[PDB]
DNA sequence: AGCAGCTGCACCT
DNA sequence: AGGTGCAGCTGCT
RNA sequence: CUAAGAAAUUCACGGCGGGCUUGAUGUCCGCGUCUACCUGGUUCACUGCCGUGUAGGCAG
């Protein structure tokens, strides 16, 4: 028995693009007609602040570079001067049926994998994973830089059963930290709903709205696009922000990456905090791979030891493997 | 060669997944031989049973939509393909490139037989429409009726009937239904004229049909040498590479009851024009004729200017 | 007698390119001015997630590969943020005259084929194949990934005889599963209609419209294009969705492949579900060919045993070869 | 008493 | 996301 | 009798870090817009009465 040649997993926990709108705090219950945060342009005169090559550290060349500065156009998004609260809204569907791949070659490999995940579900439910997902919804981690230095963050989560709301959760997202996973009754009820969605025993659709009290006219941070070339035929536009229908918006993969920031079992440390679940669980902001393949704690070696050779790892690493299965991806040769 | 007694108008034919390449040199609009074969199969299917013959096609191409893409670092274009099913060993398939497209075209069909004699025009038009709503045109399916409820019925129009001024008025009111699209004709005379005035430098014929339909940028005596119309290459027809062959003597024929030959494509120049630029609406009918003593198997549209 | 050197069956069950649109649930009766779902672009930045070679498990090399960003441009298609219902509409024409090939070199072989399929229709009608095709139109199998995890799917089929609607069918596509084949009076009436269309007794035209209740602003999944790479050149857009006049669409052959998923008589199993009918019946998702030629259950040897050798196979294998006749193909040496 | 197929291998730029 | 051939091969008789 | 006849692309993803665009300015000289017309084309389908009536008529 060997691993399959092609083997692919569709994602559970599908979010949408989060849209931004603006309003005043304590009108946030009437925040259905709040106007969108629009993306504008402004001019930026760039100074000289890079490290020099020290073949270019001659003072005459430096002053000649300072005398002629370069200029860009830059997309920017601010709150209005009369509104102090950013509202960010998206929808998230929890699907279930996490072990089944969407593509496979070997029948014996997918049957061994299916009974492996069946034994995992029978040992413990999705309660740890859904507890951590509900925590990452409770604290507003999906506000990436908009949460930083906010005065008050409040998350409203609506389980939507038919076209109307079935249940409502209200969270103070600054009390629920970004560091540890506590216990709370409403948080455990949300975790039970997410675990019921992940187990295939229901169809879970939630609407997540987050209100951050930042200040009047302050800068908000939508998702940022990719610029390949830049010339004078444009405005020397050097920064593009993502937008859905003239609304500053966040990419769906950004919200998804902030949802699955649950991995506290990586071997290097635990005082740093959780990271996102990746094969060779890596942080682009730190340029580093936790769970290196030289240690036996990346996703691929753990999966191959669990399925092929029946070496079941510790329950923390089993949580990590099933989290990587819910995350989805292309796993094969 | 034969002036039609009447014209039938296939009003707005939408076609999905039609063949785009249609030639080893062109890739755009499909060849006019497809439309001639369409009305010959239509005459075989519903034309014979009504004491009607059909002779030619006029085509106007209301809209085009090729399934192509430009590969992000080049000025040329590639075709979008399909995923064929796997081989018997389950490995993969062999990629053969085909070019699909979407078409909106109208057809002008000539009639010589007992048109208004045996049957009225409305029933003939309706059952020819019903027959053409079950076949495929150029390798791609005739897309059936959708929420276009208006453009359904045809207009069987008698050509030589009525006064000559009334003939011009009814052909103008039929041209009023052919406004958005641009009709297609053959331009062999313009090809030979430019071939003769180009032969003052060198005697070559395919280099003419190259130089006729590109953007020639001539130096300052920066200008662009331009033709007054929309001159395109077309597959002009077939010329035989072989003598005639009996129905049995060649293996793997389509039928053992029909003679076979090996052929090559003759290429010529066509032209897209506005339908108001032609005064006689029977000028646009593409006839295909065989000269079987040699290989000359032609589609053209004679009696046009 | 021998097989003809050419053999060419024109396909029946011609579908259209299914166009997508969006709106709200319980407005689906007035869903004629529903706006089209459009294809946008966005930027993605990923990490290294695939399997590394055993030579490339070096941790310094893994960190040095991580510290170069991985950026793609991706075509995406979403629902609007105020619509929760995807509407997918296509037209399907049934032609009839399922026996006659478009090309046959041997005359006596085509006469034996014609009386063979004539005797097949005389033995029983198309009602098995017609009932299975009406099942695949009843459950929304043509919603390929759009059906997965949907809240409520609902199919409306309008038979149009003249310029107006002749008859209407209304189905809850989630009650009708994808595994088994039931019997229902409306479903059997549609089966009679498509059987009579297949028998050459008419030219049936159908308009199929499927409404899936996914969620507000969620992602839909149209068809993807085939772009062969410009290898020694610049990087390309790494996903391209199919669109007909700026409306996200599913390919015609995709709907056709979803329609003929009827084959529950392949020898390997019967609980894995129906597959699409093709000679050497092979699914691309599993990557493995059922109905191998070493067993005598593929299409070619069954056709040669029924026609040339006059060994009539079992009635489900006659159903299989009749479905391969309706499917069309280019057969021969 | 062979036959036909069949799989597999190799070529090559 | 190759066509080809042919050497060898299986074989059971 | 149509370069005919046939076809599933697809699974997954964090683009963000930061910035002073500034100084200075005379828009201005001159000019013939005229001649001639039916708003009615039934153009106000109204107001009130007898009659249980919306059925039917009446009076200005």
Structure's resolution in angstroms: 3.0
| C-alpha distance from A259 to closest chain C C-alpha (Å) | 16
- For chain C, positions 102-131, list CB contacts with chain B under 8 A: 103-107
Per-residue three-class SS string for C109-168: HHHHHHHHHHHHHHHCCCHHHHHHHHHHHHCCCCCCCCCCCCCCEEEEEEEECCCCEEEE
Q: What is the DSSP letter of C246?
A: S
What lies within 8 Å, CB to CB, of B249 at 6+ separation is none
At residue A293, φ and ψ (nearest 5 deg) are -75, -15
What lies within 8 Å, CB to CB, of C100 at 6+ separation is C114
Closest CB from C105, C228, C252 relative to B256: C105
Angle between helices C252-259 and C127-138 (to 10 degrees): 120
CB A289 within 8 A of CB C63: yes
User: Which chain C positions have a beta carbon within 8 Å of B65's beta carbon?
Assistant: 244-245
Which experimental method was this entry solved with? cryo-EM
B94 CB neighbours strand E below 7 A: yes
Q: Is C330 helix (H, G, I), strand (E, B) or coil?
A: strand
Which residue in chain C has the smallest CA separation from B93?
C284
CB A291 within 8 A of CB A280: yes
Q: What is the CA radius of gyration of chain C?
A: 23
At residue A207, φ and ψ (nearest 5 deg) are -110, 120
Closest CB from C95, C203, C226 relative to B82: C226
* Cβ separation A333–C81 shorter than 8 A: no
Closest CB from B16, B72, B141 relative to C230: B72
CB C107 within 8 A of CB C47: no
* Cβ separation B152–C163 shorter than 8 A: yes
> Nucleotides of chain E within 7 Å of a protein C-beta?
1-3
Angle, alpha carbons C86-C92-C98 (nearest 5°) = 150
| C-alpha distance from C50 to closest chain A C-alpha (Å) | 6
Q: Could you tell me how many residues make up chain B?
A: 305
Q: F8 C1' – C170 CA distance, angstroms?
A: 27
**Which residue bears the tokens 């599908």?**
A14
* Cβ separation C227–B69 shorter than 8 A: yes
Which nucleotide is closest to B299, CA to C1'? F2
Q: Give alpha helix (H) positions in A7-99.
A: 59-67
Which nucleotide is closest to C226, CA to C1'? F9
User: Six-digit token pair at B174?
Assistant: 């039929």
**Which residue bears the tokens 């672009």?**
C41
Per-residue three-class SS string for A286-320: CCEECCCCCCCCCHHHHHHHHHCCCCCCCHHHHHH
Extract the runs of DSSP E, i.e. beta strands, from chain C.
Answer: 6-9, 14-15, 18-23, 39-46, 70-77, 85-94, 103-104, 153-160, 165-172, 204-213, 249-250, 261-263, 275-276, 282-283, 288-289, 329-332
Q: For residues B137 and C244, what is the distance between their CA atoms, to the nearest angstrom?
A: 20
> Nucleotides of chain F within 7 Å of a protein C-beta?
1-21
**Which residue bears the tokens 């950026």?**
C71
B265 CB neighbours strand F below 7 A: yes
**Which residue bears the tokens 């925590």?**
A135
User: Six-digit token pair at C45?
Assistant: 């930045």
Beta bridge partners of C8: C103, C330
Q: Is A326 helix (H, G, I), strand (E, B) or coil?
A: helix
User: Which chain C positions have a beta carbon within 8 Å of B95's beta carbon?
Assistant: 228
CB C240 within 8 A of CB C75: yes
Output C302-308 pairs: Cβ under 8 A, ≥24 positions apart: C303/C331, C304/C3, C306/C116, C307/C1, C307/C109, C307/C112, C307/C113, C307/C116, C308/C1, C308/C2, C308/C3
**Cα–Cα nearest to C94, from C118, C122, C129, C120:** C129
Please give the span between the terminal C-alpha atoms of chain C, in angstroms, as a whole number: 15
Cα A100 to chain centroid distance, Å, stands at: 23
| C-alpha distance from A174 to closest chain C C-alpha (Å) | 27
The verdict on A179 touching C (C-beta cutoff 8 Å) is: no
**Which residue bears the tokens 């000269």?**
B291
Q: Is C74 helix (H, G, I), strand (E, B) or coil?
A: strand
Q: E10 C1' – C268 CA distance, angstroms?
A: 26
What lies within 8 Å, CB to CB, of B200 at 6+ separation is none
At residue C145, φ and ψ (nearest 5 deg) are -100, -15
**Cα–Cα nearest to A236, from A96, A44, A14, A77:** A44
Q: For residues C149 and B207, what is the distance between their CA atoms, to the nearest angstrom?
A: 60
Q: For residues A115 and A107, what is the distance between their CA atoms, to the nearest angstrom?
A: 12
For chain B residues 26-45, those near strand F by a CB cutoff of 7 A are: 30-31, 33-35, 37-38, 40-41, 44
User: Which chain A positions have a beta carbon within 8 Å of C84's beta carbon?
Assistant: 163
How many CA atoms, within 13 angstroms, populate the side-chain half-sphere of residue C107?
6
Q: For residues C149 and A69, what is the distance between their CA atoms, to the nearest angstrom?
A: 55
Q: Dihedral through CA C145, CA C147, CA C150, CA C151, nearest 10?
A: 180
Quickly count: other Cβ atoms within 10 Å of residue B272's Cβ: 17
User: Six-digit token pair at A28?
Assistant: 């946030």
């Amino acid at each position: 028995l060997s691993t399959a040649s092609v083997l692919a997993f569709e994602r559970k926990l599908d979010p949408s693009d989060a849209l931004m709108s603006a309003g005043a705090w304590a009108q946030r219950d009437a925040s259905q007609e709040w106007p969108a945060v629009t993306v504008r342009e402004k001019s930026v005169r760039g100074t000289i602040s890079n490290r020099l090559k020290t073949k270019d550290r001659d003072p005459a060349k430096l002053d000649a570079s300072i005398q002629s500065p370069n200029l860009q156009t830059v997309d920017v998004a601010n709150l209005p001067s009369d509104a102090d609260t950013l509202k960010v809204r998206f929808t998230l569907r929890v699907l279930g049926g996490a072990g089944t791949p969407s593509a496979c070659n070997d029948a014996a490999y997918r049957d061994k994998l299916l009974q492996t995940v069946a034994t995992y579900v029978n040992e413990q439910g999705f309660a740890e994973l859904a507890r951590r997902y509900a925590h990452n919804l409770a604290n507003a981690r999906f506000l990436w830089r908009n949460r930083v230095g906010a005065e008050a963050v409040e998350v409203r989560i609506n389980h939507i059963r038919q076209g109307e709301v079935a249940r409502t959760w209200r969270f103070d997202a600054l009390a629920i930290g970004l560091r540890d996973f506590k216990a709370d009754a409403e948080l455990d009820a949300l975790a039970e709903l997410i675990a019921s969605g992940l187990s295939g025993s229901g169809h879970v659709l939630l609407e997540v709205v987050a209100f951050a009290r930042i200040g009047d006219g302050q800068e908000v941070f939508p998702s940022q696009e990719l610029i390949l070339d830049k010339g004078d035929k444009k405005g020397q536009k050097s920064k593009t922000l993502y937008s859905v229908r003239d609304a500053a918006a966040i990419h769906s993969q950004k919200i998804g990456n902030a949802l699955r920031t649950i991995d506290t079992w990586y071997p290097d440390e635990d005082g740093l905090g959780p990271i996102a679940v990746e094969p060779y669980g890596s942080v682009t902001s730190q340029g580093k791979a936790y769970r290196q393949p030289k240690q036996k704690l990346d996703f691929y070696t753990l999966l191959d030891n669990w399925v092929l050779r029946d070496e079941a790892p510790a329950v923390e690493q089993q949580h990590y493997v099933i989290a990587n299965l819910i995350r989805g991806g292309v796993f094969g040769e | 060669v034969t002036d039609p007694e009447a014209l039938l108008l296939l009003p707005r034919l939408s076609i999905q997944n039609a063949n785009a390449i249609s030639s080893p040199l062109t890739w755009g609009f499909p060849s006019p031989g497809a439309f001639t074969g369409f009305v010959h199969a239509l005459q075989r299917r519903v034309g014979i049973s009504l004491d009607i013959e059909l002779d030619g096609v006029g085509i106007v191409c209301h809209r085009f939509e090729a399934q192509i893409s430009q590969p992000a670092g080049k000025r040329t274009k590639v075709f979008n393909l399909t995923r064929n099913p796997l081989n018997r060993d389950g490995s993969t398939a062999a990629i053969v490139e085909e070019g699909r497209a979407h078409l909106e075209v109208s057809l002008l069909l000539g009639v010589h037989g007992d048109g208004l004699d045996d049957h009225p025009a409305q029933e003939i038009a309706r059952q020819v429409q019903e027959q053409a709503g079950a076949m495929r045109l150029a390798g791609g399916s005739i897309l059936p009726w959708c929420n276009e409820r208006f453009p359904a019925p045809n207009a069987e129009l008698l050509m030589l009937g009525g006064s000559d001024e009334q003939r011009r008025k009814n052909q103008r009111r039929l041209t009023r239904r052919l406004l958005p699209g641009f009709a297609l004709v053959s331009r062999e005379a313009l090809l030979q004229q430019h071939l003769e005035t180009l032969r003052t430098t060198l005697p070559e014929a395919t280099t003419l049909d190259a130089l006729l339909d590109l953007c020639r940028i001539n130096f300052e005596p920066w200008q662009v040498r331009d033709k007054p119309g929309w001159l395109v290459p077309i597959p002009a027809g077939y010329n035989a590479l072989s003598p005639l062959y009996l129905p049995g003597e060649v293996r793997n024929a389509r039928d053992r009851e029909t003679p076979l030959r090996f052929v090559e494509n003759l290429f010529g120049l066509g032209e897209w024009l506005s339908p108001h630029r032609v005064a006689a609406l029977s000028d646009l009918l593409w006839y295909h004729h065989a000269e079987p003593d040699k290989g000359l198997y032609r589609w053209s549209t004679p009696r046009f200017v």
